Design a protein around this ligand. Structure first.
Ligand code: 2FP
Ligand code: 2FP
Ligand code: 2FP
Ligand code: 2FP
Lengths: 363, 363, 363, 363
């Protein structure tokens, strides 16, 4: 075919650098970008009103935890609201995030919508006037974005059209971000729901990731400037077989070795239902797996870096410090886990081994 | 593959019926849906302010022309504004349109955006929350929608990604309309600009239409419930060869016979630069062409049903009647032309043989 | 894209003409091209040795039946052996076929082979040095060829790769024939085996035919120079619902209207298990169906034009005349059926209403 | 989608092991598989008759060179004839190859054929009854096969259909080999001919390799059991810019990092016109390039391991030893080069810096 280049050398360069910092050795991403209606479902759990101050406070208590979290967090995905919010020192949260060394993201996707002619499969919207929105968030201090897609394992799903749609709207989104100087995180999530086993999950991650990378290459996207955010390959939540963690690690790194090119900068994992310990152990075997892992293999965790601190805050302002202890413990844990240097053996659960799995309903 | 049906029998039925009425024998569509910034460029031509009343008036003078236009117009594409406007009798324009027998459309597309990594190729946006908008327009009296896509003939274009993107966003749009009870008009426009000849245009319409129909079939869309709106195959505006009208007709019906299935209800042509007579002669040879034409072969004309009436109004309210004479002459002409019963030979030009070709710039 | 034309005007012209004669009003194709191992299975039925003379004789008795079959048969698909055989008048069988007005085909496919990684799905081979073989058969008097492909309806089949492979090897084959002056018959057969209903069959014919036509268009193939040979849409042989013949006709012409372009010259049906009457009634409702059928809708029958004559010959040379009566009755019947002018009502079965359905095993 | 596994654990295992031995640290492949008509063109060069003994002898002198070549050659691609030939010790050449430690391949492709509707683009044949042939060669001691495909850089080529065809017939071939216990070498060769620069070549390797890997994944092929054999990215032979070797190395490893998954065992390079030194220097910078190279990066050289020994033999039996010195020097050189430990600086050319570039004509 023929080349009317997408990007300049200068732009290829900004892109790989923001990509490299995010997933530098030991770092991961905090996924703090629940919409208002998901954060609300979470605040109920500790019977607290879902209002703007509480949401500001809550975020304030995750971003301003002490400097032991600095070498641990390469970036934080924000929701559009929190992007324009201030800590009580009156400095806005993109300046708090930068100052403890991390890179500020924003989520730019507007949800999933049903694909007609499907057993429940969705695609996801957000492109209309995306570009405009990439240009403003970059002005405001966001350097990376995140778009989510959902696939499902069922008797007749993910359908071919489902794979193909979801792949192509990742790539559209990818391109429009790259043109605004923003690294797109790509999230093709295969849901955990169902009673599939470890091997079906593996099969499906493989056909999905394959579809994404071709799409990306069709769409011209500059892969060093991107990150993958995929499911780890696990049985399904209803599965009657039990599987070890080295198995899940194997399942996972093999599917990723069969599909993801060595130019991608790093793959940041989603928690997807695992609990705080279950995630961290899983992340850690992944980096202990003997196979050649040509990309960073790190965390991009939302519920998993938050359960415990949420149970511990309980909405009472007087518990700030106990909640940050909480989050910190988990950002310590994962920094260790992303390096294969995590050792639980001892080292305390509670709310950390409670399962954080919800209805994957739809919208 | 496997069937989780998109549509019910009841819904297949409403869809084919709105589709059949639009392009009933003798009828065509008036394309009155210029956005505000395109109508504005048009009102300048007759030095009149581009304001809301003038735009209301102007539309009022096309929709309320006499009943000699009734058997001629199966439907009218409106712009979102004119949908909520009233004639001076205080009845809104969807009720004026219905009452002279025609079916009300709306345009639902939000423009074209550049595809990066391309020699100028665009895709087009509008999906975000499309569905919501199909559901409201159907409530307000729209039964068909229109989405435009643009391809370009150049040395290295239409690129493969261009074909593939444009095809797939037609089909996404198609599906979401069908689910709200609305017939999607599909407009894959190959631009006329350039110096290609008649045969390149033909080649390109053929690879494009092929891509659209596969896409449609991937996306499950119920084809009897749709209409095509394509370019006729013509040389390029800069072309040094001259070509006859029977040639253009041949070029055109052959490409359409090689690609469009006999389940599509009818293809409504775009003017795309031809002048009022040039369009009508062209439409008319198309229906005189000896080849088996298994679908209605009619007009969906905007500038072509409007030049003359625009020159004639000149924004002076005192010329109402002369402008409607004007539009009427052209809706007569085309009703004849869509049936192959059009005879110019005599029968007066002016502004009718002036070329209505603009920069296809981009946005 | 860009045009380095496949074919010249001269070659487009020979191609559409051989295509037109085959399926001229009232005509159909006799499919006499069983390989040696399938004809052998047939000769067992009447306990006769499967040798070269018997096979010559047998073919001799189908091609030299009286002139009441002339206006009925536009062409005859031969097997490579029978191509070089002589009637006992010492004129070879391509000259016998021509002289009663029909066009001589050959089968050029070499069977199906398993696709690995499939629940039993095959593709089909024959391309190696195909061209060489098209060039010699055209020299010997073949003007059309036939290639068969097999899809299967099962819980997880036809798989996507199955559709895609089978489509693309039809198109490869198509192109190589067109370049030797030979019309390719295209046979994407969906098998009848299973317990699917009428609607699954319809769904599957539709996704399959869609895939074939895109493939054809990718491969540049000149569609007027081709013929389709597809399954009619029927429930599956194990199906517990009973369906009428007008239903099967509807199912069938709708799927064909949704997918096959009006440039294809004519679709010649396969019998696929139906019995002599069942085929003919089915063909005849197809041409009685009210829907607009923009292509000839005729027969390409092997077992269905042969059961009765096979039972009647019984390998005894003394029954020649009774067998030709037999075949003749069925070529009469179908000529009527392809025109919707067939009336059984009375008019004698026997072996004509016996089912001619076999294991669709594989090879 | 859904899994009816292609291969068993036992079969995955034989496949990765033959794949690993081929491209073990320091080893490469000798490509000794010229057909009779290409070897003949080569023997002319030294005015010797192209007969069966000479061809046996010639091959005898490459396979029985001393043990300094053992740690250097992981495998040797033979032509079908040489597979059944004996050294003068009366042991056949698969036993000579095994005994000096290497793995025996065979070429199974039958040439390229023109794709109609193309500016000269070909696909390649060989599938008919491939399987049968994989099964016999494995019985005779072949454990890997090789299939070649050709793409071309021109104004309008490689066309999309060209990419797509060539990709899919690699994958068909791939699958059929894996099912017979044979590792397929995959050769998507982009030709060097033309006046493209280094960057077009890179663009094209990237769109091509992308297409191959999707195809492979569609076709289910088990990637650890395969090897890539691609062009290095170089300007075109008519190119007026000069480019360094670190540039060519960069161009090359970046394209391979953007497309080839880390599960492929190793990529064996083709010489494609470079001369003995030019190849070896090029191979060696490739392994000196700082980028993370997650797969072996070695040689699969035919003319490049043979020029000098061919000039030196001159068909006189009395020069055996000088020719093997010759080949040996080059198998030393490359073993060094594949490890980035090659140092020319000094170390003698002649015929080693003569260019081995031919017309890429077609067949
Ligand atoms: O970044 C995430 C990670 O979660 P984990 O599975 O790693 O804990 C998610 O993938 C996002 O789904 C998101 O919070 C859901 O949409 P939202 O709730 O705002 O409307
Ligand atoms: O329905 C149409 C027909 O025009 P003709 O080529 O048949 O005269 C067009 O295809 C639309 O492009 C439209 O008026 C352009 O976008 P808008 O100007 O509102 O922002
Ligand atoms: O032209 C045909 C029609 O049969 P009907 O279903 O219309 O009776 C077939 O589709 C061919 O399968 C063929 O005789 C089978 O391969 P063969 O047996 O020689 O090795
Ligand atoms: O394995 C090869 C390597 O050559 P180099 O470019 O690495 O020297 C080739 O890619 C093959 O083309 C082959 O010898 C050509 O077909 P053949 O001549 O037998 O009919």
């Amino acid at each position: 075919p023929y080349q009317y280049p997408a990007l300049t050398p200068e732009q290829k360069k900004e892109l790989s650098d923001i990509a490299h910092r995010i997933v530098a050795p030991g770092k991961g991403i905090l996924a703090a970008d629940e919409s208002t209606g998901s954060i609300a479902k979470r605040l109920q759990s500790i019977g607290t009103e879902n209002t703007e101050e509480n949401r500001r406070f809550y975020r304030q208590l995750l971003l301003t935890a002490d400097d032991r979290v600095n070498p641990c967090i390469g970036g934080v995905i924000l929701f559009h609201e929190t992007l324009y919010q201030k800590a009580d020192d009156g400095r806005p949260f993109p300046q708090v995030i930068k100052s403890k060394g991390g890179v500020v993201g924003i989520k730019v996707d507007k949800g999933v919508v049903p694909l007609a002619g499907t057993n429940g499969e969705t695609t996801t919207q957000g492109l209309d006037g995306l570009s405009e929105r990439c240009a403003q968030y970059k002005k405001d201090g966001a350097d990376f974005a995140k778009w989510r897609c959902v696939l499902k394992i069922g008797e007749h799903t993910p359908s071919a059209l489902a794979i193909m749609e979801n792949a192509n709207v990742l790539a559209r989104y990818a391109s429009i971000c790259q043109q605004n100087g923003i690294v797109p995180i790509v999230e093709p999530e295969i849901l955990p729901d169902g009673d599939h086993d470890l091997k079906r999950c593996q099969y499906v991650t493989e056909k999905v990731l394959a579809a994404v990378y071709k799409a990306l290459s069709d769409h011209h996207i500059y892969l060093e400037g991107t990150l993958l955010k995929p499911n780890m390959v696990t049985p399904g939540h209803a599965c009657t077989q039990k599987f070890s963690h080295e198995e899940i690690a194997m399942a996972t790194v093999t599917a990723l070795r069969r599909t993801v090119p060595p130019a991608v900068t790093g793959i940041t994992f989603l928690s997807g239902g695992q609990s705080e310990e279950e995630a961290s152990i899983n992340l850690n075997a992944i980096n202990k797996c003997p196979l050649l892992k040509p990309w960073a293999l790190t965390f991009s965790y939302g519920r998993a870096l938050q359960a415990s601190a949420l149970k511990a805050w309980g909405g009472k302002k007087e518990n700030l410090k106990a909640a940050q202890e909480e989050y910190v413990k988990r950002a310590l844990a994962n920094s260790l886990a992303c390096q294969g240097k995590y050792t639980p053996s001892g080292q305390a659960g509670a709310a950390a081994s409670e399962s954080l799995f919800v209805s994957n309903h739809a919208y």
